[PDB]
Design a protein around this ligand. Structure first.
Ligand SMILES: CNC(=O)CN1CCC(Nc2nccc(-c3cnc4ccccn34)n2)CC1
Length: 332
């Protein structure tokens, strides 16, 4: 009979295909609830993400459609793969939810951040993170929103990126993380490939200090935290800032730049051997190359991949038009 079935997993009904059994709520994002399950057909575990009415508004629509196409086409070892996509509805009129099925990962970088790691693993995760971004950039995609919660890993240290970044008002009660956004983004100065290097850098630092590098209630408190530790950017940086934005920045209380050995002492890095001592200086070095405010003077993805610390692994549519676009994308 019916190719599906429904079980209650929280507060939203999950109506999925017979092949997926034993649903277990593993998490929730800002666009969909996620479940772990067993796929009788493939005989393996998978993750299922439900998107409720992804055509309700431009924001959710533009994102679900964007993901539905990219996660479909673009494929890389370091970018979560799509196993299948389906909808329990039978026609465009009835069309309601879209379910994304992907390989089941073990955890978030948030959980990895809450634990000390060796240089072997930290640099490996960092290596894969750069490969993914590399593939993304080559595919003409610049994430611009990389963060610990969007990067997943497994027990064997394999890493993969979840979403594909940005391309705006919502009644959504939950705020979005802004701690890992690059100076360019925070101040809308135009950007380029290396804008994601900043995100990476904020993440590598947090894996060291085990605390969010630049926290803040808004981009105001956010910028201060950046100039407090890295120091006011060089005058040549402001000449690239709009006359209105520059004003605000230049009229801000100047600061001195705390050296990197200070921001990241040795008590955070392992040095019980000559190997870890060296790896510490190399790790701290890369940080000072990524965590640079001025893009022009910030290391690129291909250079960071050459670093000795890493190279050791070498439109405007309506809610009705959107529903249409997304539906057909579902059913090829
Ligand atoms: C033990 N780990 C945790 O505490 C949380 N993790 C997060 C990753 C999850 N596994 C997984 N594998 C593949 C895709 C997604 C996933 C895809 N989108 C989201 C949004 C929120 C949370 C998870 N996801 N999640 C297992 C539980």
């Amino acid at each position: 009979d019916n190719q599906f079935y429904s079980v209650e997993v929280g507060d939203s009904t999950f109506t999925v295909l017979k092949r997926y059994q034993n649903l277990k709520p593993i998490g929730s994002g800002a666009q969909g609830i996620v479940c772990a399950a067993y796929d009788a057909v493939l005989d393996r575990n998978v993750a299922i993400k439900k998107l409720s009415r992804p055509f309700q508004n431009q924001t959710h629509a533009k994102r679900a459609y964007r993901e539905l196409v990219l996660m479909k086409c673009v494929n890389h070892k370091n970018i979560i793969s799509l196993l299948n996509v389906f909808t329990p509805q039978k026609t465009l009129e009835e069309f309601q939810d879209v379910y994304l099925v992907m390989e089941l990962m073990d955890a978030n970088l948030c959980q990895v951040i809450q634990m000390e790691l060796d240089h072997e693993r930290m640099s490996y995760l960092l290596y894969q993170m750069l490969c993914g971004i590399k593939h993304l950039h080559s595919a003409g995609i610049i994430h611009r929103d990389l963060k610990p919660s969007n990067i997943v890993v497994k027990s064997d240290c394999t890493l993969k990126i979840l979403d594909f970044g940005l391309a705006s008002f919502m009644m959504t009660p939950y705020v979005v993380t802004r701690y890992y956004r690059a100076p360019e983004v925070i101040l809308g100065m135009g950007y380029k490939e290396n804008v994601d290097i900043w995100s990476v850098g904020c993440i590598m630092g947090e894996m060291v200090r085990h605390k969010i590098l630049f926290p803040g209630r808004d981009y105001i408190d956010q910028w201060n935290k950046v100039i407090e530790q890295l120091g006011t950017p060089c005058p040549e940086f402001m000449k690239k800032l709009q006359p209105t934005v520059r004003n605000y920045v230049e009229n801000r209380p100047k600061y001195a730049g705390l050296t990197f050995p200070k921001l990241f002492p040795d008590s955070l890095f392992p040095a019980d051997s000559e190997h870890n001592k060296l790896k510490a200086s190399q790790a701290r070095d890369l940080l000072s190359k990524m965590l640079v405010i001025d893009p022009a003077k910030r290391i690129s993805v291909d250079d960071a991949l050459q670093h000795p610390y890493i190279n050791v692994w070498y439109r405007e549519h309506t809610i009705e038009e959107w529903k249409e676009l997304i539906y057909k994308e579902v059913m090829n």
